[PDB]
Design a protein around this ligand. Structure first.
Ligand SMILES: O=C[C@H](O)[C@@H](O)[C@H](O)[C@H](O)COP(=O)(O)O
Ligand SMILES: O=C[C@H](O)[C@@H](O)[C@H](O)[C@H](O)COP(=O)(O)O
Ligand SMILES: O=C[C@H](O)[C@@H](O)[C@H](O)[C@H](O)COP(=O)(O)O
Ligand SMILES: O=P(O)(O)OC[C@H]1O[C@H](O)[C@H](O)[C@@H](O)[C@@H]1O
Ligand SMILES: O=P(O)(O)OC[C@H]1O[C@H](O)[C@H](O)[C@@H](O)[C@@H]1O
Ligand SMILES: O=P(O)(O)OC[C@H]1O[C@H](O)[C@H](O)[C@@H](O)[C@@H]1O
Ligand SMILES: N[C@@H](CCC(=O)O)C(=O)O
Ligand SMILES: N[C@@H](CCC(=O)O)C(=O)O
Ligand SMILES: N[C@@H](CCC(=O)O)C(=O)O
Lengths: 608, 608, 594
């Protein structure tokens, strides 16, 4: 969750702990630090719980040494426990890590067979042994690291030291941020610049794929090929104490980048023993929910979009009938209620007039009861419902919704296990869901790390007046939301459509002034769409494709693949939301439109 | 000239020298430093010359130790020499000093008749020997210094250590500045915060009279008496706000509408008995200013526009020669200084690199002195100028300057009375100026109440990609400002031009896609411009005219009179800025552009 | 309850007793003094009862001496009597103490183990004996004292004296107030400034922890440790003060809105829990301050759902009232010295209120010193005899307090939100309103020749009509009277004609319908109806009904908003007439003497 590292003349323990202190706002369940004196004596401390515990544990120790690293953990692989906390060791190799090594089982078996003992359940540990192994063959720590990085698959921001030679640190970025702090005769590193503020304001941001070798007085960066690459150090002329935007230019930007932590907050207290825990609902909750044979969802705007994603989930993974409807459509028509139907409203604000009216009307129609998914406690929708689940995303200031949407999706995915009807035939469904949920936060961070590419892509839409967003199944509402976002903050006339319907009308519209975007299609779908865009090459039709890099899709001249890292299928819709959010944001930046307060839109529509 | 001090666990000499480098813009003829390891071995090193010489010596014979003081000197007592350079010593007592101990020889003979060998000419050495004396009789550094400080008359600041006890530094601010910089397990101090930036951004500014006992881990502050006062650690300074937007959508909108209030505040304390009262400048002041024969103003952007207005005023109302220049252009050219030239800088932020460079350069060029007109307290332009007039507009958050500009104008109009040349004309002049200033807040309110008209008018510009703004005389720089504003927040290519130069080029451009705006022309000028727009009737040229309702101008089909309320002449340029601000604001609103943060622009351009 | 020390060349008994006389408002059961002359020679006099009785006993055997300490006692640790009253003796070292020595239990019998006969049931005596003990040998008075306050826990203020050496007084501030008075060859030390007034107006307040030594010639304020320690562009102040209202409200708001909520955390960590006990609010004030409270009543009852009464301070102080259960006593006062208001506060102390809150604009004023809690309006000083910014900053504080006394359960949140929204709107709204000043100034011409006016308002605008009428009386000398709008027809309608314009403050459509009808009734006598209304109401003017349109405001801050044109109206009528605006005839900034 959080990384800090120091290489100085002076003792750095207090500096490390203070860094962690400043990273605490990011969800963690444990912390640790390791420092090495000049004689190469390495002292390591790890504790379950808050950074405060770690600091106390440190109170007893003369923690001397000028080199060290430190970490706060958000467990994905192995229960939160002192045993599982970072830094993780392999004798003299010491390692802190953000992210997920997903080829961790292959690597753990291979390293076990080579004579290593895994004392922990983490995925992180294979890094420590691996580097160790790679150093066993010889070379410098840098060379060993270069040999090791390529064997890893997934997300890693990692910092690595050799206690036998404390004058150097190695760091590698791939799917998780790292930034270097330059001092006077000392140097630093962190996953989050806020941690370095107490000791420097001069930073070098590591970019995707970078690998750095840091000493007290040198920084050398380079790519996986050992080829020295250069990055600019820049004074941070930022006012960190100015207001609530923190380091960000826009509320909506901050709310996009805050998504991993908002999600951790949504998850807090709702995973117990590898299972979804919704006990917060009351002792007799399972009592009402067991009776449910049908779900009705009402919402407006982006909330309607999340509902729309959830429909696919409920029906495929929980096998309960689910209906989702624009709230104003529901309030004004005479409907036919399904038997044993649960009424769910989704709303960021809890105050949207159509949605509220929908609920109120439902009061007199024979629903088993109502559940409110909301982001503002004490709002009408929460008060007036039987049950309520808060998204806990923190306040959202941007008029366009971002973290509210993804946290909503998180709650809706947790409902799936607790509302199952496939018998079954289950067990593994809930395990899969919980696994994905556990990975979600760092998966989102993985997406954020692709931002430079999305920024670049934005140039392709900056001057367009139309766009068409395509999706199929659980990705169709993602296209809905991507298209909405582009309408919202860039004022481009972007429209979403079910992928399968492209040829039934919109194909007639396509030309150079109307780019087509597909979100996460499988090979079969892709080939269909590729043929479609062929039909319109002559008018300059461009197909942009957000897809799994594992799929091996290849770009043509009018079909452009924008590869994304692999993810758990069950959370793939939340994952693919991020690049469409980032696209819209970067287009708006280029055009210079009012991102936080788009023309004619309101945060919530509360008057009739 | 410069003082620097560090008390840390790491070696502080490198930090001290770097501090001195960053203090090179002041002083100086010699320099030196003194450090101390844990055993008490004090190493001192001093050179006549540049800091680079001292750093050179320091390099091939390194100073080791975590406690230390350094200094750059501009000699006042004693010829520049290694002998007289700081730090000065009294055995174990070591001292650095800025300013003057006025009663030096009395105390020097007093101590000389006590066994003290004065090896230097400086007034500084007395400080050392006295501290030595007071410590002779028990206690420790603090008590002693607390006794000694009252026995020194003069405006000065000093940092004092005892090498028998390296764990503490003592400081005294008594007429010359000192600020403490808070580190991590280490602490610093200097004569200006510019010196501590490499190492910290947490500052505690000492109040006049304060005495500080500083350790690695602690900082205790007292006053002349020795009664522990507490001081707070600022950093910034430019906080927002929320919230403070009040009834308005945007920071910039709010800042536009608060201009009457901001102007009232700019006037506060500066009007009495129907006259301009700038007594806040100092008892002297009225006498440095009397010697001025020429005004030079330097600024960037909107501040440059305000300077540009003020030239007209100074020359016609006060009869003083006045030149105004883009700061970039001033700093990069060899200029000819006028006899008895006052340097004025205009700056909202006080940090703009070009303008600061201009001021510093002015110091080597033989200007009578400098005045900063600024909106942000304690900023660089203010600290480095001889005189300062704060605009008191409150913090301004929008990237485009609005209230900062009109308050600048207010202060500049105030300077006219206080700098007249040109006496006898004369009281009629200061009279009209004060009458206008008193009318100003209400005139602005009148103008703000035309907003609906301006908002309707903006529909004529919201689809345009070109505009030409015209003005004559004290209104030409208002056209400059109106054009800049339309550039800034609506991204329309608006260009200002002197009204009499239209025929010399731009007239060939005018057509339906390039509306022409004139700012407050009299009847003769308007006849000329109407005739001009008639020349391009066949291309659909339109003239827009913001003019006095009293003037009786009649709209036609290609000329649209946008009548305004009447104003006192002397404030007309300030008055006519408001509509142009509102116009740019409302065009931006329609287009939906980012008003508060326009693309590519910055609040303040501080780096190179 | 109260202290009065003294050292001089003259007999100080009369002094000490007058110093007490003035600290009688503090509530006490016993009293006494101890003086000492040139050679010997101490004399002590203590009585149960009123300080008056004491003085009468003093009359019979006139106490002589240039040094002396005196006390008025509220018994809080040892029965009310003569034996327990101050000063307390110990062979020569005499002591007068305000407060409680909390560790008097383990120190008194700890010191009885040394032959120290405790002759009273007070904690105060463990002060007298301790010091006596540390004067076996140990410098002199100040030296022994700088070794006693360290081991004497609690919130107190003691004044100590020696008898062998009559030239010195010691004084310790470690819980309750002491202020020193200078000093023409003689010095003084009271528990309150008020006690020193008949003799000296020069004061040196002790800070928390200081040990002071006083003689004829010097006043050293040591420490526990502890060594030596020692109109602008405006024609009138009232005009300036009206136009400074936006800045003044900004200052009132500073630090008090945190994370979208009202933050009165300045009241103390406890406070908040103390306010949770309040069940009824009682407000006491005079003049314009009364008008502000009058507005807040509507707010507290409708928005916080808590009961509130508001009363002319003079009325409250002279009647036997029925206190409500769990009642908070709030006073409103610009100056902090209004005698009626102060009297009401002091009376409330003995009537069983949960406690007192002072809303005030002058720091260190009596109302502030004598109240449990305080909220300063921070308006800056107000010079004009007629209050302007003091009024609207008062309204801003009372409004802030609404959310903090909320009793409406799950409604509370939303309401607080509205209040915050409105508070945050307030500065720019007032700025909107001040730009109507040219309109008001023109309007004033209608009133400058009048000798009568009627101000009407309903609900939370009713008190604003009161304030508006008051302003017109104050600085224009026009007989303006306010009436609840619904009462117009019950008498005053008979008065209406051309020479008595009627002013309505911010009516809704329904009320305006009623009043328009009413003024139709008096058309034959030229009844004229002036209406300050929201432009969004779309009211239309006629020959006898003049709509004076204003910008829309947030409902919750409307009374503050509508106050401003009334101020400007009064101001400009006065300007036309050329009356003494900053100093209207027969009126006073503050009415501080009976
Ligand atoms: O084309 C318009 C129809 O008249 C349509 O409006 C519908 O018939 C009514 O709105 C009733 O619908 P509900 O019975 O569902 O309210
Ligand atoms: O066309 C370019 C010129 O070479 C010009 O650059 C000039 O010669 C120098 O810039 C000198 O400038 P100053 O002497 O004014 O500094
Ligand atoms: O007409 C006057 C009455 O005499 C009046 O003074 C009242 O009857 C009591 O004297 C006072 O009332 P309180 O008991 O409240 O003081
Ligand atoms: O989620 P709700 O509070 O019910 O609001 C529904 C929609 O309202 C507005 O249009 C907001 O701009 C949207 O971002 C939001 O999705
Ligand atoms: O006035 P200064 O703080 O010196 O800045 C000069 C200019 O700098 C930037 O460009 C700001 O965007 C401008 O609005 C400002 O006028
Ligand atoms: O508010 P206070 O300081 O308690 O004074 C109450 C009243 O006293 C005097 O009459 C003043 O002229 C008034 O303007 C004030 O309202
Ligand atoms: N997957 C690693 C790292 C988690 C993190 O990024 O905090 C673990 O479970 O320990
Ligand atoms: N007057 C001292 C100090 C000069 C300075 O402030 O630089 C000297 O000449 O040494
Ligand atoms: N507890 C002390 C306090 C003295 C007082 O405050 O009057 C007593 O009862 O005497």
């Amino acid at each position: 969750a959080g990384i800090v590292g120091a290489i100085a003349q002076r003792d750095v323990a207090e500096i490390l702990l203070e860094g962690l202190r400043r990273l605490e706002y990011r969800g963690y369940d444990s912390a640790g630090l390791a420092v090495v004196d000049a004689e190469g004596h390495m002292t390591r401390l790890r504790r379950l719980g808050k950074v405060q515990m770690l600091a106390q544990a440190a109170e007893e120790h003369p923690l001397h040494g000028g080199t060290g690293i430190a970490h706060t953990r958000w467990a994905t692989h192995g229960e939160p426990s002192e045993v599982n906390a970072h830094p993780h060791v392999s004798e003299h190799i010491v390692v802190v890590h953000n992210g997920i090594i997903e080829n961790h089982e292959p690597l753990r078996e291979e390293l076990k067979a080579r004579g290593y003992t895994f004392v922990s359940e983490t995925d992180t540990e294979v890094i420590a042994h691996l580097v160790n192994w790679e150093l066993k063959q010889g070379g410098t720590l840098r060379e060993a690291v270069l040999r090791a990085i390529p064997q890893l698959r997934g997300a890693y921001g990692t910092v690595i030291m050799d206690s036998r030679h404390p004058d150097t640190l190695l760091a590698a970025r791939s799917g998780s941020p790292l930034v270097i702090g330059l001092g006077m005769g000392e140097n630093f590193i962190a996953s989050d610049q806020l941690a370095l503020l107490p000791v420097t304001r001069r930073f070098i941001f590591l970019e995707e794929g970078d690998i750095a070798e840091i000493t007290r007085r040198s920084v050398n960066i380079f790519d996986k090929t050992g080829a020295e690459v250069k990055r600019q150090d820049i004074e941070s002329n930022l006012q960190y104490d100015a207001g609530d935007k923190g380091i960000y230019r826009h509320y909506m930007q901050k709310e996009i980048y805050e998504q991993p932590n908002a999600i951790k907050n949504t998850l807090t207290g709702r995973i117990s023993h590898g299972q979804v825990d919704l006990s917060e609902l009351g002792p007799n909750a399972d009592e009402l929910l067991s009776k449910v044979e049908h779900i009705q969802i009402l919402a407006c705007g982006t909330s309607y979009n999340s509902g729309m994603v959830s429909r696919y989930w409920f029906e495929s993974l929980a096998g309960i009938p689910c209906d989702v409807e624009i709230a104003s459509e529901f309030r004004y028509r005479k409907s036919a209620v399904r038997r044993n139907s649960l009424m769910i409203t989704l709303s960021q604000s809890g105050e949207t007039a159509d949605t509220l009216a929908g609920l109120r009307l439902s009061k007199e129609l024979g629903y088993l009861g109502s559940l409110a998914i909301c982001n503002v406690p004490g709002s009408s929708l929460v008060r007036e419902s039987d049950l309520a689940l808060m998204t806990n995303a923190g306040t959202e200031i941007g008029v366009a919704s971002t973290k509210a949407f993804t946290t909503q999706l998180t709650v809706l995915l947790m409902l799936v296990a607790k509302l199952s009807r496939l018998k079954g035939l289950d067990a593994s469904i809930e395990h899969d869901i919980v696994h994905g949920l556990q990975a979600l936060p760092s998966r989102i961070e993985q997406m954020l790390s692709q931002d430079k590419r999305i920024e670049a892509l934005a140039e392709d839409f900056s001057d367009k007046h139309h766009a068409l967003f395509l999706g199929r199944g659980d990705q169709y509402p993602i296209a809905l939301e991507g298209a909405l976002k582009l309408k919202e903050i860039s004022y481009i006339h972007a429209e979403a459509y079910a992928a399968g319907e492209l040829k039934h009308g919109p194909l007639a519209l396509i030309d150079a002034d109307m780019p087509v975007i597909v979100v996460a299609p499988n090979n079969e779908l892709l080939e269909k769409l590729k043929s479609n865009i062929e039909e319109v090459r002559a008018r300059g039709g461009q197909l942009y494709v957000f897809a799994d890099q594992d799929a091996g899709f290849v770009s043509s001249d009018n079909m452009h693949i924008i590869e994304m890292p692999h993810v758990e299928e069950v959370i793939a819709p939340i994952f693919y939301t991020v690049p469409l959010q980032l696209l819209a944001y970067h287009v708006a930046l280029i055009k210079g439109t009012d991102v936080d307060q788009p023309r004619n839109l309101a945060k919530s529509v509360t008057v009739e």
